[PDB]
């Protein structure tokens, strides 16, 4: 399997902050990373595909980029609608795999 590590397991912020989330591949998957957003109960939505290109309709204050095998998702300016949990993925090798999940909340 292309196993995945994701950290920090939970984060915290306030309105307007700049926050970071990292996903590290256990093997050198080239650029087939994608990122998804899950609100509690509700179904997901995809945010970033091919590890750089943000998906249509998403407010551009979401942002991510590749770095070797350490993929980084950030929120440029967190807003009161972002409080959810986010998942990492790779799609080059079957079976596609999964993040561990990381929540985001006020303090």
């Amino acid at each position: 399997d292309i196993q995945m590590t994701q950290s920090p397991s939970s984060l915290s912020a306030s309105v307007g902050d700049r926050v970071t989330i990292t996903c590290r591949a256990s093997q050198s998957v080239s650029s087939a990373v994608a990122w998804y957003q899950q609100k509690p109960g509700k179904a997901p939505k995809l945010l970033i595909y091919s590890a750089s290109s943000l998906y249509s309709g998403v407010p551009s204050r979401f942002s991510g980029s590749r770095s070797g095998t350490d993929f980084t998702l950030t929120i440029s300016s967190l807003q009161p609608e972002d409080f959810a949990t986010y998942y990492c993925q790779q799609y080059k090798y079957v079976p596609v795999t999964f993040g561990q999940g990381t929540k985001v909340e006020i303090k």
Binding site: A32, A43, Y55, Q89
Partner: peptide, 11 residues
């Protein structure tokens, strides 16, 4: 070609 899981059923 494969570009992530676009549309999700209601679960």
């Amino acid at each position: 070609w494969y570009s992530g899981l676009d549309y999700w059923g209601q679960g």
